[PDB]
Design a protein around this ligand. Sequence first.
Ligand code: HEM
Ligand code: HEM
Ligand code: HEM
Ligand code: HEM
Lengths: 146, 146, 141, 141
Amino acid sequence: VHLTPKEKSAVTALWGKVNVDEVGGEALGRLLVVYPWTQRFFESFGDLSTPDAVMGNPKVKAHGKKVLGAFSDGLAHLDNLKGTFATLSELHCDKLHVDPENFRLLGNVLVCVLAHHFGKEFTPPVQAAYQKVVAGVANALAHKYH
Amino acid sequence: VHLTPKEKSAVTALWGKVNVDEVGGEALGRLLVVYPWTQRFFESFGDLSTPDAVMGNPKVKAHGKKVLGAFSDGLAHLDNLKGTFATLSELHCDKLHVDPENFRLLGNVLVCVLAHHFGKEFTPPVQAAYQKVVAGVANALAHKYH
Amino acid sequence: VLSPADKTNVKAAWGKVGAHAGEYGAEALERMFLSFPTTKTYFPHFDLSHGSAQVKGHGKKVADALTNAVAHVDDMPNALSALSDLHAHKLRVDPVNFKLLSHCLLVTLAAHLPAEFTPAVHASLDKFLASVSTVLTSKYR
Amino acid sequence: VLSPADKTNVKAAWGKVGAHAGEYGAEALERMFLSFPTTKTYFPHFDLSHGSAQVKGHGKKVADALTNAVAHVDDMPNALSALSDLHAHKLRVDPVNFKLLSHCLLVTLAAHLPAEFTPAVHASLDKFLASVSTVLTSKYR
Ligand code: HEM
Ligand code: HEM
Ligand code: HEM
Ligand code: HEM
């Protein structure tokens, strides 16, 4: 995906301020709460009975951290997302058979979490730049279906 | 997209029997009837007030013929759909701003029209091969969004 | 919303299916599993090969549920309430998958009932299956 | 379907929006036009630049419609019937676009109301906006 320099600047500047220990878990937790069918893929995580249970679940925070790392990795290779996400594409598509619509949903939940954390700093143009990024990541993760 | 030889065989064999003067118009007409918001892009075509008006509309049949030609062209280059559909991607995405979900819908309507015309000959495995094809075409037409 | 013409069209088209109801349901499932392999994961206790008695039996169940919806088209949320609970709560079926099965049911009908599958009836059937899908996905919580 | 807790959550969150209702609607539209440029084509008679009086005025209209839906949450098809006719028949708005605006409204609420945007309320608001979207797309014919 192609970001303008202004967009690259906006994205990289905000990402530097991201709490990398927490934001990933918050996005994954919210995915499980807002789109409950996704819980089908995480039965080994234990207590997902309430929103409070989900957000406080140690396995959700831990796994969310790995997700966020992958997004960070993507932000470093915006010009080669397909190669960056090849192994993860095989995992989510060939092994897990996650419908790719859910890649888009997680991306949009991440965008909501970034808005929540950054407030007025998450301007409409900054959002537009992040939408290009999460669309690119979702498309790359879905490549094994293509 | 990658078809097995058996799938390639199934697809090419059926396509040879397709009425190339009519099937395209039938698919485009059904798109306009079943998903009426798509009529927004064809106001210059005249009478679209009833299903009978749409299916009998000379401009719908004419334009449908061009669509089908593009699919035929794609069937000849399954290993390079992106290049094949580059100009059409710029048209539908950059100039027309058609949401790419509609590329998928037209593809699925085409699959319904093929089922209608070929009956029991349109077996579940033949359908599965054609679903790979129309997914590939839709993804290639949407490349300018990616 | 389903118009009067839609309900007439769906009732008439489904009337033509007849004793083939269960057979067509089984065929739609088969089409779905082959065309969209992600859907197979909901059925690990099923043998999904051609001629599987399990797919045949399940096709009949699907068809009977659709027939119930046709028979109670003005009261579908009530009629399908139990099935909505099952698919959303217990089974956690991804909502995208209902679009896939709906498409495979249309293809099945097109392949078997050429005279009935007019553009107008195609539109009505698509709206009907979308309405059924809306009810069956209404219970995620 | 919206649960009792969902309706409580949505009413409470929307209560906090207050006199900012129209402003937030305008901001959601702006977010949508910038993030998803295909949506701009519905508004050729609009100047969609930042600070546009037309986007501001339209944001107020959007917000007032959502407020009507909140106020009549158990009777939304009736309350929104006129707007459903407009968007589906006259304007021919692609159903995909309602998901895009819904997302931009959630982002707007998240950016302005951090205390209210809990995971539970996020879920309720998403369900509410999906319900509104279902009504506004119910009239294609
Ligand atoms: C942009 C979207 C996504 C990204 C970037 C992402 C990234 C990741 C990463 C980095 C891992 C860890 C892989 C490893 O341990 O080496 C993982 C595992 C996993 N993902 Fe995701 N993921 C995404 C979407 C999803 C969604 C939407 C689902 C389900 C609804 C899902 C289900 C899983 C599961 C079940 C695992 C565990 C696999 C295992 O441990 O065997 N992923 N993902
Ligand atoms: C797989 C999907 C599609 C294919 C293969 C396709 C193919 C084509 C082709 C070959 C043309 C003629 C271009 C030319 O004259 O050189 C065309 C034009 C056009 N297409 Fe499609 N199309 C697809 C989907 C759609 C959809 C879904 C819409 C709207 C809902 C759409 C709207 C249009 C319009 C408005 C034109 C006329 C453009 C003009 O004459 O300036 N297309 N398309
Ligand atoms: C028109 C849409 C659908 C209808 C009418 C329908 C109907 C039914 C019926 C009648 C049953 C059996 C209920 C019972 O025995 O108590 C059932 C079960 C089931 N459905 Fe569906 N269904 C639909 C869509 C789907 C989709 C899209 C999926 C997943 C891709 C799905 C997955 C399942 C599963 C996994 C079961 C349980 C099978 C078992 O454990 O034996 N359904 N459905
Ligand atoms: C939550 C979803 C939505 C709500 C509550 C909403 C509400 C409204 C309202 C209240 C009006 C003005 C009605 C009037 O003045 O008579 C309107 C008009 C309009 N809407 Fe929406 N709308 C929604 C989604 C959308 C979407 C997704 C699109 C397209 C991307 C769209 C495109 C339009 C257009 C083009 C107009 C007419 C503008 C004009 O000609 O001045 N709407 N909408």
